[PDB]
C-alpha cells in the first residue's frame, strides 16, 4: 500500500542540473525523514541526502555539498532532489528511500523503483567476500567489518539489504540481528561493535542477489561495497 515513485531522470551535459521527484502515498509523508540513494555503474550504494520529517535539517555527503539540493513538500506528498553542477560521478540510479520509525535504530524500510541519471572519519564498511557462489540447501556467510564501533547507547546501527537486478534494495535485517517482518527466518544476522555477519541457510533458489551492509550510525550514512550471491 506504501508506495514512492520516482521520476525525472535522463541524460545530462556535465555542468548542467536536473531535478528528481518523487511522489509518495499509502503513508503519512510528513511523518517521515527521507533519504536519496543513488547506485553507481560499479553497483556501488552511496547517500545522497536526508531531510527531516519537516524539513528543518538537510544532510549531505562532501560529495555532492553545495551541487544538490533535498526538499519536501508535506502538503503534496512530495520529495524532491534538485542537482546542479553535475559531474561524471553523479552518473547513477537514483532511489528514494522512507527512514522507517518501528524500530529505535535507523533503517530504511521502503524504496522507489528508482530514476536514472547519466552525466555526459567515516565510517568505512568492509564487506567480505565480493563475491559468493554457494549450492542449493548450504550455507552463505557475508562479513562486515566497520572501521570504528556502529554502537550507540546500547544498539549497534548495522542494517542488511538485499538487492535482485532493476530492483531496489530490500531491507532483511535491521539493528544488527532483528528480522524485518516478512522476511523468511533463513535469514539471520549477527555481532555487535564492528564485526557483523550475515547468515543465509539454506540457501534457495530465489536468494541470488547482492547483498549490502549499511551503518546508520553516523553521517554520512555509508554501504559495504557488496556480496554477489550466485547460487549452484
Known amino acids: 500500500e506504501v508506495k514512492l515513485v520516482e521520476s525525472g531522470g535522463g541524460l545530462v551535459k556535465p555542468g548542467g542540473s536536473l531535478k528528481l521527484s518523487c511522489a509518495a502515498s499509502?503513508?503519512?509523508?510528513?511523518?517521515?525523514?527521507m533519504s536519496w540513494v543513488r547506485q553507481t555503474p560499479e553497483k556501488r550504494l552511496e547517500w545522497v541526502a536526508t531531510?527531516?520529517?519537516?524539513?528543518?535539517?538537510?544532510y549531505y555527503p562532501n560529495t555532492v555539498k553545495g551541487r544538490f539540493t533535498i526538499s519536501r513538500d508535506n502538503a503534496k506528498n512530495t520529495l524532491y532532489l534538485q542537482m546542479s553542477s553535475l559531474r561524471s560521478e553523479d552518473t547513477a540510479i537514483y532511489y528514494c528511500?522512507?527512514?522507517?520509525?518501528?524500530?529505535?535504530?535507523?533503517?530504511?524500510?521502503?524504496w522507489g523503483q528508482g530514476t536514472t541519471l547519466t552525466v555526459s572519519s567515516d565510517i568505512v564498511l568492509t564487506q567480505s567476500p565480493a563475491s559468493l557462489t554457494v549450492s542449493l540447501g548450504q550455507r552463505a556467510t557475508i562479513s562486515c567489518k566497520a572501521s570504528?564501533?556502529?554502537?550507540?547507547?546500547?544498539?549497534?546501527?548495522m542494517n542488511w539489504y538485499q538487492q535482485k537486478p532493476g530492483q531496489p534494495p530490500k531491507l532483511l535485517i535491521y539493528a544488527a540481528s532483528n528480522l524485518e517482518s516478512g522476511i523468511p527466518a533463513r535469514f539471520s544476522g549477527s555481532g555487535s561493535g564492528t564485526d557483523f555477519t550475515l547468515n543465509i541457510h539454506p540457501v534457495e533458489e530465489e536468494d541470488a542477489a547482492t547483498y549490502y551492509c549499511?551503518?546508520?550510525?553516523?553521517?554520512?550514512?555509508?554501504f559495504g561495497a557488496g556480496t554477489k550471491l550466485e547460487i549452484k
Open positions: 570504528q564501533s556502529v554502537d550507540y547507547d546500547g544498539d549497534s546501527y
Open positions: 528511500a522512507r527512514h522507517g520509525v518501528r524500530h529505535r535504530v535507523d533503517y530504511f524500510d521502503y
Open positions: 531531510i527531516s520529517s519537516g524539513g528543518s535539517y538537510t
Open positions: 549499511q551503518q546508520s550510525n553516523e553521517d554520512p550514512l555509508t
Open positions: 499509502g503513508f503519512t509523508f510528513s511523518s517521515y525523514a
